[PDB]
UniProtKB/TrEMBL annotation, chain B:
It comes from the Eukaryota. The chain holds residues 317 to 598 of 598 of the full protein. This is Ribosomal protein L46. It comes from Toxoplasma gondii (strain ATCC 50611 / Me49).
From TrEMBL, chain C:
This is Uncharacterized protein. The chain holds residues 283 to 380 of 380 of the full protein. It comes from Toxoplasma gondii.
Automatic annotation (TrEMBL), chain E:
The chain holds residues 218 to 333 of 392 of the full protein. This is Uncharacterized protein. It comes from Toxoplasma gondii. It comes from the Eukaryota.
TrEMBL record, chain H:
Residues 265-274 have a biased composition (Pro residues). Residues 84-105 are annotated as: Disordered. It comes from Toxoplasma gondii. Residues 86-102 have a biased composition (Polar residues). This is Uncharacterized protein. The lineage of its organism: Eukaryota, Sar, Alveolata, Apicomplexa, Conoidasida.
Length: 188, 225, 98, 133, 116, 60, 61, 283
RNA sequence: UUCGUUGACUGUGUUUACCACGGGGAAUUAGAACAGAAUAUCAAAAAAAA
RNA sequence: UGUGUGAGAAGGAGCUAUACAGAUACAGGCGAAGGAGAAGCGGGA
């Protein structure tokens, strides 16, 4: 073996071309900024009005109504979660002394990382199925119920996500590319 | 095999392993497999509010500023376009009551209940669960678990006669799980104690189990009033 | 009134319930807005929809800047039913919306 | 105070005002409706409930309304809560908690700098709840 | 050979010493403004590896104030009292407000060092 | 199991000339042993010469 | 503290006197505490004080 | 799984004011100490890398994604999070008004709010992620259903669906599922903390035992080997008495003399507080 | 909260920690009073067909 | 009721006269929460 090697995380510049190009473009940048600032209306003068007094009152009323109804709806549930939560602790405290350690663990429990030199109850690694996904399991039904604007926003969200994570697959398939020696890292 | 059922319930046939006791009560484990609905539904107010907000925004010109340079990106997944341009086995099936939360129940001989299994001294509860699932339910059956802690427990004492054996009673610790969509149904092995299985709703649940059994887990199930 | 989850769901609040649900704003300090030249007094109440045109924007979620209203920190949003009887009967005229 | 508690706790036919999470202590916020008219004595009902709560194995810390209203400010209440808690949770030197000494800021003749509860001061970052008396 | 003469060599030496420590014993009448215990804000390196006692400061008790240099001063007309802390293994100074009167031998018990 | 522990290293630091403290208690060692009766200074060269003589006399 | 404490009233105020073991002894401490309790009994310092206003409703906190 | 020498990077520089050099400002003491005050480090003196496409660029993309998903979903998740932690027990329904027949979203929340007099503006302010930690926490845990799905959905194209249409029974589902995944063990940290610690489950004092059937008496006998009562007690509870002898030596003796009768330091530190599961009292 | 502010104000008095003196100045109280101008926080809201 | 105290051209690697009109004073308020995993941005209110 080499007997002396230490790698550190590294992101090659060639793999991030999409992100870089998107960011450096002024036309796109401006648009991005615009999207962040939805109204983009002047707010630095007394002679400014977003809405007339008559328009705001209906908004207020609707908001109030919405909230009023939703609270009422939700309280019923809240009581149930409460009730349910009551029982879990009871059962946990009732377990034997030797089984207590396993009753205070998370779903994603895993052993600590071991940096071995170069050449129980935990059985399987945590892996959330895709099937169980809300979006996964209800996308087809919701998709058809989406509106024009909704669809538009969906498209834009997709685009932005893609932009943010271009090399997701690349990383997955060839993780070793995203690694460089410590001496090379600390001398860039 | 009735011997396994008798060894499970009663203590007359001794098992082939050492049992784990707790204050004279043997530790047990259970499982409850539930399924999510298949059809999406929305409240009434939600729609109203949404519609109103959309309309108002549109009217007042207060909506998001979506540029043409972002929304028109050439990507493989592209399905978007302008509308103007567009003009150019009655209780064992998994497809029962799509808009309901179905619960799994087994039948021990002539009694409807949840699966049960004893805990081996030195073994973990997850191991017990695993074994339970792989022996009573099906060989290739492996539902997704929600956690390691239980949610409910109960106590069951033996009559005055069987108490002379040495075991005072039982200790059950109920557990919850979910059914992975797209998976097959159960497959009872030849050497399993379960005689039958069925999927039932919250509403119909009380009609199978006794109140005693009902109450022990009524505070852990989902609310569908 | 409601007595079940379905009734809760299909609940129809009355005009009295909506009036109780009406939002109000309360002042803290006796300050004068440097922008609008609007005086403020302590213990007074006003409608959120007419207290300040600019503040409403932020409150509703149409402004990322919190500094839009100099006297914004001096605001206390509450419900009409939360207000005391005394206060209600005093500023009843200024809270109407006819 | 960095103390975990539950408000409006249900323990059967009895409703507790505040219930602690870490320790067995229930704080009762007595109001004017819990006492007779022009008097300083509790009612039969509340006495009974107190009795029951005691029997249950839970300590009860009373808080009268006239004592709370006098302590107008938060500085006078922060140290009083501590003191009260201590007096209840103490295991050593058991005696009648009736004729005990009391000295709070802004009520009693004392120096302004004479504090008890330092602003954001906790040894070993241990919560007050967990602190052992 | 050679030798570097230190700047603190004779006659150039520190004449004023850091008189750090307690200044009032138990059962000692004091009035506001008097310094009970003197301390210094300067801390040396490796404090946990020394034998000396002056490297450790005392905590305030009752009717005491902390000055700019971490000095403990009284706040009322009374007697000085000392107390030990088990939770911390550190002494604490306490002042009991008392009026000017003859100190009897039967009241000495009131000023005893107790553990808390 | 048996091991060949490494000997300490000399300290290149100037120290006082203070006195030699007494012993805590008698040291018990199996087999033959040689001990002193009075306190005194011993040099590394002296100890090394004693070790060499002992090894030569006893053998390999 | 490993001490025998005895409670008593003084100047319309509660107070206590300790008796450490390390001073007297294992056996002596208890004897001294009981002897002091007898002196307080004779002096009448064990009686609890009281405060009255004479008007119904008016009290002292 | 991937395997490579991850190594460890050097610590970051904290910095300090250009004042005070003879003394030691690094004493390892509790904050706000009345005797050992801690030196303040102004924020402006902390070295920071220049803003670039890496530091600032991606923050813009994350903020645009958050704007598209909507701040109301973040506020609802926050509310839920805050509420779930103070209503672990059955509670009497609470009304926001003295009279009428209205309801509230949450009793514990209502109480808390009414008590603390939390600013209405400050609730809205936070949702915009003014700071960098709010953006990093949205990137790591941004999904609506994060209590359920962990960070699984942190790279999902179709994630806005959750934030748009996840109300009702579905919402309840999330709450139900999260409680069974939350942590319940002990915490081990060093740095200062200003917050109410999470609930910790207590441990029992009644361990289990193994038994096996025996036909010679038709009875279940314990598998443990018979021993003296003294031994049994010793093994179970511990040494009997206020004190005992030290532990024996495992390792072989030392070939040369070693002054093992000397303590580590002339002055040992004070004892540390006890931290761990509590004993369960008999009901 | 991305919150306020300039008190880092202006006068009367000869009592006090330490003490060769000097510099009350390795740096102590509300001298708890008196005569002006500023900033910050309020308090209260119980009783739900027995 | 039990503490203060570094003299000798003795030892050591003591040593820097500096900062701030404020995200360095600053009322009120907030403030860091195991391990595994994602990201490769030295970020607590």
């Amino acid at each position: 073996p080499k007997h002396l090697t230490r790698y550190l995380p590294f992101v090659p510049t060639s793999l991030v071309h999409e992100t870089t190009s998107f960011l450096h473009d002024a036309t796109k940048l401006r648009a991005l900024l615009a999207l962040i600032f939805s109204p983009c209306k002047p707010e630095a003068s007394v002679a400014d009005e977003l809405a007339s007094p008559a328009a705001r009152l209906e908004f207020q009323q609707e908001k109030e109504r919405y909230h009023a109804i939703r609270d009422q709806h939700t309280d019923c549930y809240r009581r149930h979660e409460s009730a349910a939560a009551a029982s879990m602790w009871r059962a946990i405290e009732a377990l034997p002394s030797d089984l207590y350690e396993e009753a205070v663990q998370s779903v994603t429990f895993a052993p600590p990382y071991e940096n071995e030199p170069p050449p129980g109850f935990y059985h399987e690694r945590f892996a959330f199925p895709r099937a169980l996904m809300f979006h996964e399991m209800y996308g087809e039904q919701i998709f058809q119920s989406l509106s024009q604007l909704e669809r538009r926003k969906l498209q834009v969200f997709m685009n932005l996500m893609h932009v943010r994570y271009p090399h997701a697959e690349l990383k997955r398939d060839k993780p070793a590319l995203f690694w460089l020696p410590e001496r090379q890292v600390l001398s860039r | 095999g009735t011997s396994r059922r008798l060894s499970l319930f009663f203590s007359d046939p001794p098992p082939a392993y050492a049992l784990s006791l707790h204050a004279g009560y043997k530790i047990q484990a259970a499982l409850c497999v539930d399924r999510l609905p298949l059809v999406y539904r929305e409240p009434r107010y939600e729609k109203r509010w949404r519609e109103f907000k959309e309309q108002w925004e549109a009217q007042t010109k207060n909506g998001l500023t979506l540029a043409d340079e972002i929304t028109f990106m050439k990507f493989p997944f592209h399905f978007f376009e302008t509308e103007e341009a567009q003009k150019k086995k009655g209780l064992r099936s998994l497809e029962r009551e799509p808009e309901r939360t179905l619960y799994l129940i087994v039948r021990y001989g002539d009694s409807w209940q949840f699966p049960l299994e004893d805990r081996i001294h030195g073994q973990s509860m997850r191991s017990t669960l695993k074994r339970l699932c792989s022996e009573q339910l099906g060989s290739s059956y492996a539902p997704f678990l929600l956690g390691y802690s239980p949610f409910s427990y109960a106590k069951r004492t033996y009559p005055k006669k069987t108490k002379e054996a040495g075991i005072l009673g039982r200790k059950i610790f109920y557990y919850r799980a979910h059914h992975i969509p797209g998976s097959e149904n159960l497959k009872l092995p030849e050497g399993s104690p379960v005689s039958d299985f069925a999927w039932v709703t919250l509403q119909e649940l009380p009609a199978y189990i006794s109140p005693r059994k009902l109450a022990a887990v009524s505070a852990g199930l989902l609310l569908e009033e | 009134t409601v007595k079940s989850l379905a009734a809760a769901e299909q609940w129809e609040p009355s005009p009295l319930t909506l009036k109780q649900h009406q939002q109000v704003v309360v002042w803290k300090k006796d300050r004068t807005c440097i922008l609008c030249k609007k005086e403020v007094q302590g213990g007074n109440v006003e409608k959120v929809e007419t207290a300040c045109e600019k503040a409403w924007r932020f409150l509703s979620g149409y402004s990322r800047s919190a500094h839009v209203c100099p006297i914004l920190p001096q605001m206390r949003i509450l419900r009409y039913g939360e207000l005391p009887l005394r206060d209600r009967a005093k500023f009843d005229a200024k809270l109407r919306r006819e | 105070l960095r103390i975990a508690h539950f408000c409006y706790a249900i323990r059967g036919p009895l409703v507790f005002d505040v219930l602690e999470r870490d320790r067995p202590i229930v704080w009762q916020c007595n109001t004017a409706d819990r006492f007779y008219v022009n008097s300083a004595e509790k009612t039969t009902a509340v006495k009974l409930q107190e009795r029951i709560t005691q029997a249950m194995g839970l300590k009860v810390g009373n808080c009268e309304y006239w004592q709370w209203m006098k302590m107008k400010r938060k500085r006078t209440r922060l140290e009083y809560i501590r003191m009260q808690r201590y007096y209840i949770l103490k295991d050593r030197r058991q005696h009648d908690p009736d004729f005990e000494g009391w000295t709070l800021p802004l009520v009693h003749h004392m120096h302004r700098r004479n504090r008890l509860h330092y602003d954001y001061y906790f040894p070993n970052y241990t919560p007050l709840s967990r602190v052992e008396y | 050979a050679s030798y570097r003469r230190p700047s603190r060599a004779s006659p150039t030496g520190q004449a004023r010493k850091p008189h750090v420590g307690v200044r009032r014993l138990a059962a000692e009448y004091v009035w506001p403004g008097v310094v009970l215990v003197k301390q210094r804000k300067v801390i040396a390196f490796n404090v946990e590896t020394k034998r000396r006692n002056r490297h450790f400061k005392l905590y305030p008790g009752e009717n005491v104030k902390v000055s700019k240099v971490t000095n403990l001063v009284a706040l009322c007309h009374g007697r000085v009292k000392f107390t030990h802390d088990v939770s911390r293994d550190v002494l604490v100074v306490n002042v009991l407000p008392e009026r000017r009167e003859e100190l009897l031998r039967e009241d000495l018990w009131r000023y005893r060092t107790e553990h808390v | 199991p048996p091991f060949r522990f490494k000997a300490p290293q000399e300290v290149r630091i100037k120290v006082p000339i203070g006195r030699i403290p007494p012993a805590v208690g008698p040291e018990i060692r199996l087999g033959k042993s040689i001990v002193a009766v009075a306190p005194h200074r011993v040099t590394a060269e002296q100890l090394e010469d004693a070790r060499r003589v002992l090894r030569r006399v006893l053998g390999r | 503290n490993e001490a025998w404490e005895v409670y008593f009233y003084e100047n319309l105020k509660k107070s206590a006197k300790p008796f450490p073991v390390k001073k007297f002894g294992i056996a002596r401490a208890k004897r001294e505490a009981l002897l002091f309790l007898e002196q307080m009994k004779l002096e009448g310092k064990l009686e609890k004080p009281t405060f009255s206003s004479g008007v119904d409703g008016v009290t002292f906190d | 799984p991937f395997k490579i020498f991850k190594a460890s990077p050097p610590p970051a520089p904290t910095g300090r004011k250009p004042t005070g050099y003879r003394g030691n400002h690094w004493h390892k003491k509790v904050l706000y100490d009345p005797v050992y005050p801690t030196t303040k480090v102004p924020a402006a003196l902390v070295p920071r890398y220049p803003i670039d496409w890496r530091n600032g660029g991606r923050a813009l993309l994350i903020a645009a994604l958050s704007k598209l998903e909507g701040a109301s979903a973040l506020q609802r998740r926050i509310f839920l999070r805050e509420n779930s932690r103070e209503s672990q027990v059955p509670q009497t329904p609470l009304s926001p008004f003295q009279t009428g027949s209205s309801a509230s979203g949450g009793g514990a929340y209502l109480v808390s709010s009414l008590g603390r007099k939390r600013s209405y503006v400050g609730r809205i302010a936070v949702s915009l992620m003014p700071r960098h930690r709010q953006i990093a926490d949205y990137q790591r845990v941004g999904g609506f259903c994060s209590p359920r799905c962990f960070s699984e959905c942190s790279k999902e194209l179709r994630r806005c669906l959750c934030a748009w249409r996840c109300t009702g029974f579905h919402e309840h589902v999330v709450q139900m599922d999260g409680m069974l995944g939350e942590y319940k063990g002990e915490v081990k940290t060093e740095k200062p903390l200003f917050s109410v610690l999470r609930r910790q489950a207590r441990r029992n004092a009644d361990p289990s035992e193994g038994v096996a059937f025996c036909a010679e008496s038709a009875k279940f006998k314990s598998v443990r080997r018979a021993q003296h009562p003294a031994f049994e007690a010793f093994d179970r509870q511990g040494p009997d008495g206020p004190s005992q002898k030290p532990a024996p030596r495992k390792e072989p003796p030392l070939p040369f003399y070693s002054a093992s009768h000397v303590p580590n330091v002339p002055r040992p530190p004070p004892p540390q507080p006890y931290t761990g599961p509590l004993k369960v009292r008999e009901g």
